[PDB]
Design a protein around this ligand. Structure first.
Ligand SMILES: *[C@@H]1O[C@H](CO)[C@@H](O)[C@H](O)[C@H]1NC(C)=O
Ligand SMILES: *[C@@H]1O[C@H](CO)[C@@H](O)[C@H](O)[C@H]1NC(C)=O
Lengths: 49, 118
């Protein structure tokens, strides 16, 4: 006759996580590496998005 | 959100490469715009294509950019050749999606392209 012994399944090989990096670099060098910095009363805030 | 774009290659001056606004599906439009900005100067215009067929270019980019629209993959492709170091910038694709009669372009997405010999 024909008998069913066990069940077979394929196991995942490697786990992969990805979120979208998709963007531009980011305006940081112009802040930290800037040649000159603003005074403590004419305040320079740069927007980052 | 909705749409998206990335990619691009860094190349030497005098090269040729194809900027592509990677498609996000079928979207209603009448004007596709390639636009460029570099730090330290006013954000400037590159070229607009029109669904009707009109094509407009900036004064400083004659003979070096070719704009084309592909309606199957609904993407605009800019073939750029004869490059000089004043193209070092990040390039954005502004849409035209009719909002109340036009507006709200999706130029949030950018592609950083710097042309340099080293
Ligand atoms: C995201 O991808 C772009 C090009 O695909 C690359 O220039 C950038 O460095 C990437 N971001 C990170 C954090 O790796
Ligand atoms: C500032 O510039 C120098 C040389 O260009 C570089 O070595 C340094 O890493 C930069 N600063 C930061 C925070 O990356």
């Amino acid at each position: 006759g024909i008998y069913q012994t066990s069940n077979f399944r394929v196991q995942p090989t490697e786990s992969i996580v990805r979120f979208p990096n998709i963007t531009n670099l980011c305006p940081f060098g112009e802040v930290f590496n800037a040649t000159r910095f603003a005074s403590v009363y004419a305040w320079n805030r740069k927007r980052i998005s | 959100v909705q749409l998206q774009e990335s990619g691009g290659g860094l190349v030497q001056p005098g090269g040729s490469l194809r900027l592509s606004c990677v498609a996000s599906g079928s979207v209603t439009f009448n004007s596709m715009g390639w636009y460029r900005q570099a730090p330290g100067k006013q954000r400037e215009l590159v070229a607009q294509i029109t669904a009707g067929g009109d094509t407009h270019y900036a004064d400083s980019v004659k003979g070096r950019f070719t704009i084309s629209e592909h309606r199957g993959k609904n993407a605009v492709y800019l073939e750029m050749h004869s490059l000089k170091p004043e193209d070092t910038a990040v390039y954005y694709c502004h849409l035209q999606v009719p909002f109340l009669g036009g507006g709200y372009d999706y130029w949030g997405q950018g592609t950083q392209v710097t042309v340099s010999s080293g």
